[PDB]
Design a protein around this ligand. Structure first.
Ligand SMILES: CCCCn1c(Cc2cc(OC)c(OC)c(OC)c2)nc2c(N)ncnc21
Length: 207
């Protein structure tokens, strides 16, 4: 287990997402599904010139998996996945400028639902989750677990759970008062409202 500090601006963004009063929390799901969709476009595009990129799995889909016992909602994709370098350095580096612009825009009166335009919609997970665990496997790298409860740090470790082939699982450990996002009817409503044109099958698992 390696522990890392977020760059100061990302820590500030995370605290703002956790601390600001903002009732329209449901927008987290569209942000995460959109990230999965982008990741599936990416591996789809790369495989046009190198079909061996799909040896790790041909099926391109998104699964939404609620689990009331664990209080988790998991967004699964078989997209491109993320390398260790992504997880520790590169996404954070790209995210710094997006963070600064988002924070600026939040005066001029943008609101939190606009986070996705700044490339940091991932952090919207913290509207609803007290901890987020990301299991991910990229073709060029090993399977990793990233995790953070915010507070300025995150961890990364090689994952020894079940091998996933290729892609990403974002496990949202939900806040005690956010268990509505485990209900089948609430998830269907949100997907229908915000994500009904995604070009990959989205399967809502039931309990
Ligand atoms: C361009 C942003 C892409 C990074 N990313 C994201 C969003 C993301 C964004 C992050 O920082 C902006 C980040 O660092 C903490 C991260 O770590 C797990 C994930 N989701 C996926 C996904 N499902 N599959 C592939 N790449 C993804």
């Amino acid at each position: 287990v390696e522990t890392f500090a977020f760059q100061a601006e990302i820590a500030q963004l995370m605290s703002l997402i956790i601390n600001t009063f903002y009732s329209n929390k449901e927008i987290f799901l569209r942000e995460l599904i959109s990230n999965s969709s982008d990741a599936l476009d990416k591996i789809r595009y790369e495989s046009l010139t190198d079909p061996s990129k799909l040896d790790s799995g041909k099926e391109l889909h998104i699964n939404l998996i609620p689990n009331k016992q664990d209080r988790t909602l998991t967004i699964v994709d078989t997209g491109i996945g993320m390398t260790k370098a992504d997880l520790i350095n590169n996404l954070g580096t790209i995210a710094k400028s997006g963070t600064k612009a988002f924070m600026e825009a939040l005066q001029a009166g943008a609101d939190i639902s606009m986070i996705g335009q700044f490339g940091v919609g991932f952090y919207s997970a913290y509207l609803v989750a007290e901890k987020v665990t990301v299991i991910t496997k990229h073709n060029d790298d090993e399977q990793y677990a990233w995790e953070s409860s915010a507070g300025g740090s995150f961890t990364v470790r090689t994952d020894t759970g079940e091998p996933m082939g290729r892609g990403t699982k974002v496990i949202l450990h939900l806040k005690e008062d956010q268990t509505e996002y485990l209900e089948e009817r609430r998830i269907k409503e949100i997907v229908k409202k915000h994500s009904q044109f995604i070009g990959y099958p989205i399967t809502l698992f039931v309990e």
